[PDB]
Paper text:
The enzyme [name] phosphorylates the substrate thymidine 5′-­phosphate (dTMP) to form thymidine 5′-diphosphate (dTDP), which is further phosphorylated to dTTP for incorporation into DNA. The fold seen for EhchA.01616.a/TMPK is as expected for TMPKs: a central five-stranded β-sheet is sandwiched between two α-helices on one side and five α-helices on the other.
Here, the 2.15 Å resolution crystal structure of [name] from [name] in the apo form is presented. The model of EhchA.01616.a/TMPK consists of four monomers per asymmetric unit. Hence, we are confident that the dimer seen twice in this structure is the native dimer of EhchA.01616.a/TMPK. A sulfate ion could be located in each of the monomers of EhchA.01616.a/TMPK. The nucleotide-binding pocket is structurally conserved between the ADP-bound T. maritima structure and the apo [name] structure. In the apo structure this loop is in close proximity to the ATP-binding site, with the loop oriented away from the binding site. The Ehrlichia protein is instead a type II TMPK, with the Asp9 residue being followed by a glycine residue.
Author numbering:
A (entry chain B): -2 to 133, 151 to 178, 188 to 201
B (entry chain A): -2 to 134, 151 to 200
C (entry chain C): -2 to 134, 151 to 177, 190 to 200
D (entry chain D): -2 to 134, 151 to 177, 182 to 201
Amino acid sequence: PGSMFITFEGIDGSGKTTQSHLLAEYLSEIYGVNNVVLTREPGGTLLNESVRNLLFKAQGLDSLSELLFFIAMRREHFVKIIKPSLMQKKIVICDRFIDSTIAYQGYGQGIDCSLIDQLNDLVIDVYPDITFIIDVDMEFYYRVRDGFYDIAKKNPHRCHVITDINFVHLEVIKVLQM
Amino acid sequence: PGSMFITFEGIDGSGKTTQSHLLAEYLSEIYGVNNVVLTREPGGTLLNESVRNLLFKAQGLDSLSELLFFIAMRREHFVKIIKPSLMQKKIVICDRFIDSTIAYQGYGQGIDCSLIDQLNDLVIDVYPDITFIIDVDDMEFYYRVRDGFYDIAKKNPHRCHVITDKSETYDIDDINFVHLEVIKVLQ
Amino acid sequence: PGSMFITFEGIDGSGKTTQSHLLAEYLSEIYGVNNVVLTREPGGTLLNESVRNLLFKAQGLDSLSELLFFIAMRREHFVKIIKPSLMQKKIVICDRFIDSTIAYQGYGQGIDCSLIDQLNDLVIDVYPDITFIIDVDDMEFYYRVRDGFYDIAKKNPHRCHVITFVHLEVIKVLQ
Amino acid sequence: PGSMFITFEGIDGSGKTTQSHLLAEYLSEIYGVNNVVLTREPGGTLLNESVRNLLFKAQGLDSLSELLFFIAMRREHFVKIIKPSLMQKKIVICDRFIDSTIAYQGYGQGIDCSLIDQLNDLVIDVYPDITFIIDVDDMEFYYRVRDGFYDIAKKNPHRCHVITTYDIDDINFVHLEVIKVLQM
């Protein structure tokens, strides 16, 4: 149908995942299940999902290690799923992407955002057409949220912040179709 | 006893692993088993070993992805195992490290060596004191890798020592010969 | 969605593992894969899995030592996996937990059950909301453990429910 | 020859390991190698040394998990090595034991020393006859551990001996002091 690359972002528990599924079902009804690819990071391939399970069972990663695993995984997910889907003119919807890395590894853990930008640019050559930031150690979580707000202000050509399951879905479609 | 970070490098089938084990035994006898830490990459921690087994079954992994997995594992390994052992003034021997990555990911796979240097410096803050590159006396890929090890040796003469695997004057089995050369560099 | 801590228990071969997966699938379809943590003991973390493998090849390990290894693993598992998942309002499904230790190490091996209780209360601060014991048909040893699971249920009726298709009962009881 | 349970204690780098080997050699010369059992914690059996290697490669244990691993390993070590040796009237020398756990897990990490005492008494039913604490020269953690060893020495004045000019090595000085204390 023509490539489109949509991402959902925000804090865990914000309803990102639910919204990404609701969009997938909506777009699938219009363009056909085969033309819509619903995926997620960290994950999206068998390898990545398997690495994700290991990381979950390890905990206690150095923060830069964690960043680097997420960048490796993104590279693999981009090359195998995202970019070939786009080359084939499908719609890709990804639950968590480059903005989560900035928010969590950058603002949260304190890793330099210019490094994270460089790493993201090293591994992908297509950025999302549109990103929906769903807005719903407390000091950590305040930083992460500030990161998402800053991302939205830095990238208003791409990011749209939707505030506070059906209402949110309706605004997602509204914004998507302008 | 005194911190000392020693790495073994070279193409696969070169005897790096054997030489690393032999030196570990040699130095353990002198300094005590507690003061010699033998490790390897990719690996070194339970997570890294598990990730290594996954990667070993991965079909057609993008070379840039593979580099980044190795750099992530290196970070883990450095922070958990290598740096704290050297802080405790121990000898660390690592079978494969930063030079394998330049030779394989850079020369082999064509990834920018300057990027790989940057990624390595990003993840470690202590370089090996001594690196033994064990030299064996698609094939184009193999030969690029070999070239990579030689250029690293030429670019790092302080740190690296190329040890050839053939006794030129005495009749000595190759494994013992190389080991004796390794011990010789340490004097 | 809301924290819920569910354990499956029973003798080896009871089908508790199969049931734990099936409940995970059923709940994952309702609340999302990300809000359902499927885990197990002994295990749950890479360290615990490696230690478990060692314990499996250990010949004639002192039973109190073995108890303490399983208690150290449970603590690690609880701190790293179970508690943080529950704090994030997720559902945790654990295949084997505190009751397995009571049945195998207390009733089976003869270690004082009140010691086992004390060690369990030392390492965890959240008990399961519901425990499903799946029931099936040296045997003296095996019968004491089986009986152990009945007796635990009897002492903890507010928490344990014994099941004698099995999956449909689990879902009906959970509702 | 006679049951004797000796331990060596102190912070890492203090020379505990070296002093335990030297004492093992000295006593093996007098009583015979078969009558002196040199061992260590955490470790001392194949299972324990394998667990130790896994702990090294996992890092970032909860402090209570770590304690409990060390206690499980102590139980196994006591049952298989220490108690049978003492029952045979041999001399047992252990590099690190109950006092390390108090200093590190208790004073260092903050776990209640009473809990540690109860866990120790759960797994062993004899204390060392003599314990040599070798006193050597995040830093907060370090200072707490060192303080713990001093407190242990004060609370156990019978069992514990803190060892701190002659024309010899520090290693040999400490070794001779250990021998001298032993002849009392």
